[PDB]
Amino acid sequence: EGTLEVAMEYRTVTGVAGPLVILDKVKGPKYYEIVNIRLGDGTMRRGQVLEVDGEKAVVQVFEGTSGIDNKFTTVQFTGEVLKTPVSLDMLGRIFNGSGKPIDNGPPILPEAYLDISGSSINPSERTYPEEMIQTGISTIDVMNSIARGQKIPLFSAAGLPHNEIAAQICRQAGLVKRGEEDNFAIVFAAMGVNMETAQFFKRDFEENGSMERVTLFLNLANDPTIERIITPRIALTTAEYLAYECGKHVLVILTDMSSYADALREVSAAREEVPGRRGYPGYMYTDLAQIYERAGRIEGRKGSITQIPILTMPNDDITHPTPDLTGYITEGQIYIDRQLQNRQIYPPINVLPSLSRLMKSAIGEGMTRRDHSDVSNQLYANYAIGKDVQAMKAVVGEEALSSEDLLYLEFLDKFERKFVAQGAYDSRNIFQSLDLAWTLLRIFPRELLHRIPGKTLDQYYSR
């Protein structure tokens, strides 16, 4: 091997402003070379070199630029991009936003260093998702299903129980099983959460007994804002290593996707870049793509990555740039309703916008029923017509609902009452739920049904 070399140690910082430290007289820089700045007081912090020009090099530190002296701070060039020591032993532990251990345990002994921001899977190599996932929630598996490799987020405004829903999904997660060594190895990114929520997550995962197969990546709001952006990267790097190069399927969870976007806006505004909508950086589509567009089933390997992010509509508006880009990229969405939450429904999923783009392949002959697609279509379409009936009744009166409209309103009411609701630990299997789903479909006349053919449901039999 070519002879080793020790890192250069510079002191020529020649200007500081904002989150940027400017160097000079640098001999042989490297773009995105990771630098570990040591201040005069002796403390250390890291950062990235975002631009290289001439002998100059512009560094954006991690822990902030406070307390840096233009004549006493020393910069060292590791000469490599950021690498996370991924290993199989990383399971069942917790880490800070930067990945430092926080589980009162020893640092990870790496099997092999893997550069984060890894190269894309060859598009030809990528294969379509084909197997359903038992998240442990009824309404997700019954309609708007999930395939083992399909990405789909959870849309939920502020104040909604989406974090509790994520915890329930993580603890109740499992394969359909219709094994354990290669079973779901859940990676749980945590991008910018409150300390109370962090303690909630830690206690829920520790007590659940799933800590034997789950790795957390906690990052609080008190952490440096830039450290928030590398978190959902380190998490996906570890997920890629565990799934593709280690075999076991991974069900990655990202929390507060909006917080990552806020972390991006702050960093970009500091960098003084061209702004997109709402002042968010223009290339956010690219950087949300680099995060989302990783889950999938590579052909040459039996692993599988499944992506379940959680967003947060800032103004409770789906037209906000973050949900807009997500819905452009993420292949479907699960929607949570504030009004249904007000109606005291624990899983307040609003089925009208809750669609799975890959549900057509999630259903099949290996799993579900031959009428699953038709039942989903009917219970997804008649709900909108029942909502329109409710609106017409509101704008005219109770007598406005005719013999057909009244049936739609009753269908909507019974649907919001029985089918959607579920227990806090309800593993309602597909068939028992689809029975009452067809009961709801049969609340409406069995011949008035327009889209569905009666023979498809006739393949199924009542009782």
Binding site: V52, G118, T286, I329
Partner: protein
């Protein structure tokens, strides 16, 4: 030869670049990354590096290729997935088992070792060939019939023509000599991608693009070689429409390119086209995958290469056009290309004219769209190829005031307006009849007249019915379900039928997967003729009661025929043209007879 001076994301500045000319391919770093000169200042120059720039170091070697951006447009590209720089994905994966895309690989555009059955044409020794002359043809595979043509800007007399047989791409075939010098040609042809492939003369198009979808085929048609735009806000999944067009178009070849498209979608394309077959007049089973090429680079790929992806796609489509075929292209998510332009220009600090997008956005987008059309090809024989461009402009936030949408709708000929309302209601096509508009109606008038003169009249009547339905919906919402005129009620009726049956296709069921044009004409004629009969009944019914007031009673007594009208969409096209035309004849005549007899009854 040269060395790097500044690196800033995709943009890289190299020093000692004195002889460099604009838009000349360049090799950067020990990994020899692809780059194109964009801005030259002094001895230095600006390079956009299509590969990922992370990890560069100052004084990395910079090598001039002296050649602008070029694609190897020889035979064999059909049925192969190519990157934005047109590198072969499958060969890369086979050569390096690592499924991850390597950085620094130099796989050639096409294999130099494939043997192709080469059939020389009627050309003879000493014949005066010119640029674009089909000296021969070659069979890449079934239904390819690849025509090897002399590259333009080449002429001479045939000093030697190769005999029929298998040939490597190194092998010379023609040895024409123009100015005494005997120049030897081969199958490989490289084209400056930015400069369009020349044509003899552009000309008007009058062959409609048959999508197989009722709404687009009838309401807002497009001609072969036309230019189309599909905004498709988030949640619409326009890619299903694009894939349906690719599968069931009448085009000779499909060039699908996805800039910013999801990797899953390309996986779906490559995994579903080979099984799906199209029936040619010979009738043999044949895979669409051979008819289709994929130039897409996923969203994970560097954004510097969006422009290269789109231009390689358009030049490959042009190359197939000059072969005499009719080729259609879909450019998924050109909004990703707009964001790529913004990101590149942002580093150059060019002043943002509008919403961050550089000023020279309309120019580039207009060039890309204007490369489309139907042209008379060069050389002999007298080919008339065509390129159809159907792009996509995803509106950030779903607002059509977006600059990319503004420029596209300014320069596009036919516009298909997707809407969030129909998508939410699970309509499936989600093609809004209002905002969508086709400027090709005048051109296709001759085709409509020769096919069926009734089509234009029923089309105008359907448009009027839809507009009246929208106006009546607004008026009713303002006032209420009360005080609905019997004529207005009958107008809202069968407009609901239009929306429920003709304007919507399942797109995932065997019957609604592909809608033949004749059955679409029959279905529109049935709906509009029922409407006309209703108007006639309103005119005379032995009093205003039987005329129009009893339209509800008519619906009660004609319920079976109305149900037949709404179910006529459910029938599959596999029954064949005679079965469908006979069924539509009997349905129309039964409807007319029952309506007239019931109109005769009590009147």
């Amino acid at each position: 030869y040269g060395y790097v001076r500044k690196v800033s994301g995709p943009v890289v500045i190299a020093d000692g670049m004195n002889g460099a000319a604009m838009y000349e391919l360049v090799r950067v770093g020990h990994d020899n990354l692809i780059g194109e000169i964009i801005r030259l200042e002094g001895d230095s120059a600006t390079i956009q590096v299509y590969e990922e720039t992370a990890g560069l170091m100052v004084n990395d070697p910079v090598l001039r290729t002296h050649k602008p951006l070029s694609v190897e447009l020889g035979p064999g590209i059909l049925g192969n997935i190519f990157d934005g720089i047109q590198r072969p994905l499958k060969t890369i994966a086979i050569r390096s088992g690592d499924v991850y895309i390597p950085r620094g690989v130099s796989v050639p555009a096409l294999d130099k070792d494939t043997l192709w059955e080469f059939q020389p044409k009627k050309i003879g020794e000493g014949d005066l060939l010119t640029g674009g002359d089909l000296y021969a043809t070659v069979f890449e595979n079934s239904l390819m019939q690849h025509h090897v043509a002399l590259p333009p800007d080449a002429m001479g007399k045939v000093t030697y023509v190769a005999p029929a047989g298998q040939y490597s791409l190194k092998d010379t075939v023609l040895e024409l000599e123009f100015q005494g010098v005997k120049k030897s040609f081969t199958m490989l042809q490289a084209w400056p991608v930015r400069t369009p492939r020349p044509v003899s003369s552009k000309l008007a198009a009058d062959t409609p693009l048959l999508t197989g979808q009722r709404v687009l085929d009838a309401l807002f048609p497009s001609v072969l070689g036309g230019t189309c735009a599909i905004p498709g806000a988030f949640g619409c999944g326009k890619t299903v429409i694009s894939q349906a067009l690719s599968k069931y178009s009448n085009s000779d070849t499909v060039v699908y390119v996805g800039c910013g498209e999801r990797g899953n979608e390309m996986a779906e394309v490559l995994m579903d086209f080979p099984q799906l077959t199209m029936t040619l007049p010979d009738g043999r089973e044949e895979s669409v995958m051979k008819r289709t090429t994929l130039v897409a680079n996923t969203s994970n790929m560097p954004v510097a290469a969006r422009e290269a992806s789109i231009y390689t796609g358009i030049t490959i489509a042009e190359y197939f056009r000059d072969m005499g075929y009719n080729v259609s292209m879909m450019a998924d998510s050109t909004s990703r290309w707009a964001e790529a332009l913004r990101e590149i220009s942002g580093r150059l600090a060019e002043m943002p004219a509008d919403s961050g997008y550089p000023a020279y956005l309309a120019a580039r987008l207009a060039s890309f769209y204007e490369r489309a059309g139907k042209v008379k090809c060069l050389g002999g024989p007298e080919r008339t190829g065509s390129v159809t461009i159907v792009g996509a402009v995803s509106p950030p936030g779903g607002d059509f005031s977006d600059p990319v949408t503004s420029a596209t709708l300014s320069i596009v000929q036919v516009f298909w307006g997707l809407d969030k309302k129909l998508a939410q209601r699970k309509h499936f096509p989600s093609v809004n009849w209002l905002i969508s508009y086709s400027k090709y109606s005048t051109a296709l008038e001759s085709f409509y007249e020769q096919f069926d003169p009734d089509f234009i009249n029923i089309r105008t009547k359907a448009r009027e019915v839809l507009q009246r339905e929208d106006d009546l919906n607004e008026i009713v919402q303002l006032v209420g379900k009360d005080a609905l005129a019997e004529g207005d009620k009958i107008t809202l009726e069968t407009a609901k039928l239009l929306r429920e049956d003709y304007l919507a296709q399942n797109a995932f069921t065997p019957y609604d997967k592909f809608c033949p044009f004749y059955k679409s004409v029959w279905m529109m004629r049935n709906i509009i003729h029922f409407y006309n009969l209703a108007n006639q009944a309103v005119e005379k019914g032995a009093g205003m009661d039987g005329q129009k007031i009893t339209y509800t009673l008519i619906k009660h007594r004609l319920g079976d025929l109305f149900y037949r009208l709404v179910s006529q969409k459910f029938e599959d096209p596999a029954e064949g043209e005679p079965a469908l035309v006979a069924k539509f004849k009997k349905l129309h005549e039964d409807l007319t007879a029952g309506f007239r007899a019931l109109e005769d009854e009590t009147r």
